[PDB]
């Protein structure tokens, strides 16, 4: 097969110009196609055959290709341009090849520190022999974080499940994380903690079977 490389992230301020690159061996020889895909929706051809724009696509979307690097440019960036972008080429050796894709973040909002709420298990869940701690992370921006759990201070390996952040009705992001365990473990520790790291900053909340 062939391979198309794409930066995983490209954040740009509204109005500014965004350049999304795609790299491949003499990709300049091939015919480059670019697709746009917004959450929950299907891909949309925005630029085809190196630089043609299908009817319906704004002129801001210009395309170029030469050498081993194909580039998709979006000028006068609009919040509506936020999406995942994929380059693609037809390779008689690989048939249809898609790039790794690039999430384009249109930074039209100031940084927002996350709000963290940690709920202890409901005794009710105990009757199912389960004990789940739920860490809800809300109101942050951009949408990228990392969660970490602790038991009496030391990290926790087993039982964690975390969702990728997604947009709240208010255009900020939220995420949730779970620490699954037995009612015994829960009651046997003095406390547990959910630690959230966002834009270099850390917020940590704690609960105790006692309080």
């Amino acid at each position: 097969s062939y391979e198309l490389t794409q930066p995983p992230s490209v954040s740009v301020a509204p109005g500014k110009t965004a350049r999304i690159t795609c790299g491949g061996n003499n990709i300049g020889s091939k015919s480059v196609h670019w697709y746009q895909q917004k959450p929950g929706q299907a891909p949309v051809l925005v630029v085809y055959d190196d630089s043609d724009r299908p009817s319906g696509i704004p002129e801001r979307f210009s395309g170029s290709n030469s050498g081993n690097t194909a580039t998709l440019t979006i000028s006068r960036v609009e919040a509506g341009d936020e999406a995942d972008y994929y380059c693609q080429v037809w390779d008689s050796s690989s048939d249809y090849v898609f790039g790794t894709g690039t999430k384009v973040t249109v930074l039209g909002q100031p940084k927002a520190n996350p709000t963290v709420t940690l709920f202890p298990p409901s005794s009710e869940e105990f009757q199912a022999n389960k004990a789940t701690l739920v860490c809800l992370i809300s109101d942050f921006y951009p949408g990228a974080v990392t969660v970490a759990w602790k038991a009496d201070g030391s990290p926790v390996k087993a039982g964690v499940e975390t969702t990728k952040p997604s947009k709240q009705s208010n255009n900020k992001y939220a995420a949730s994380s779970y620490l699954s365990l037995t009612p015994e473990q829960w009651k046997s520790h003095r406390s547990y903690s959910c630690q959230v790291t966002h834009e270099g900053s850390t917020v940590e909340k704690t609960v105790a079977p006692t309080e």
Partner: protein, 218 residues
């Protein structure tokens, strides 16, 4: 024109699935239709394709042997059948019209196919009580844990739709148990706690289950 795909599929490992792609105009004419798929949070992967007016079909090395892209008599519908399903085949399957130069201009809405060894299970709903202390002086957060259901999806509302502002229902998590879990929370005035009853209304059609859970102060 437009491509109409078939509905979501829930399958047990080892079985097979067959998806449909209907041309809006009634036929695919001389076009070549491709089947591309996308796993959760993953990129786009080409699976193969067919040109209905020639009865010829291609396949990607990776699926050669497990896939079969056919069409009906009228050539008005393209079918994609994946066999020996694996958890790894869980993804959204699209169909699209190929371009002369190698791209794809028209895509379908996609079909979700979930592969799990689990069987349909209504949800258990637990409360996310607000702290005896309180949350954020003035406002407060309470919620619902919609634990271990299958398949997707579940919908959540609050106080029968009355309480809308301050609400957020999170995406689901797929636990090792193969079951789905999700939470839905709302921020409300810390003063309402005790005088205002709060209930999350959960509905999971796959199981004809409906839960109206009351969330009280710890």
């Amino acid at each position: 024109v437009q491509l109409q795909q078939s509905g979501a599929e829930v399958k047990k490992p080892g079985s097979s699935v067959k998806v449909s792609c209907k041309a809006s105009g009634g036929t695919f004419s001389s076009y070549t239709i491709s089947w591309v798929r996308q796993a959760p949070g993953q990129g786009l992967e080409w699976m193969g394709g067919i040109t209905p007016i020639l009865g010829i079909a291609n396949y990607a090395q990776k699926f050669q042997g497990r896939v079969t892209i056919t069409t009906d008599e009228s050539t008005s519908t393209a079918y994609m059948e994946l066999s020996s399903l694996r958890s790894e085949d869980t993804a959204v399957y699209y169909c699209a019209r190929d371009t002369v130069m190698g791209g794809m201009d028209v895509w379908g809405q996609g079909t979700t196919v979930t592969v799990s060894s689990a069987s349909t299970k209504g949800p258990s709903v637990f409360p996310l009580a607000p702290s005896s202390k309180s949350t954020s002086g003035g406002t407060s957060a309470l919620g619902c844990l919609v634990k271990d259901y299958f398949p997707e999806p579940v919908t959540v509302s609050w106080n029968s739709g009355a309480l809308t502002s301050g609400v957020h229902t999170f995406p689901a998590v797929l636990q090792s148990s193969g079951l789905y879990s999700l939470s839905s929370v709302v921020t409300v005035p810390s003063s309402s706690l005790g005088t205002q009853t709060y209930i999350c209304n959960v509905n999971h059609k796959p199981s004809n289950t409906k839960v109206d859970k009351k969330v009280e102060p710890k």
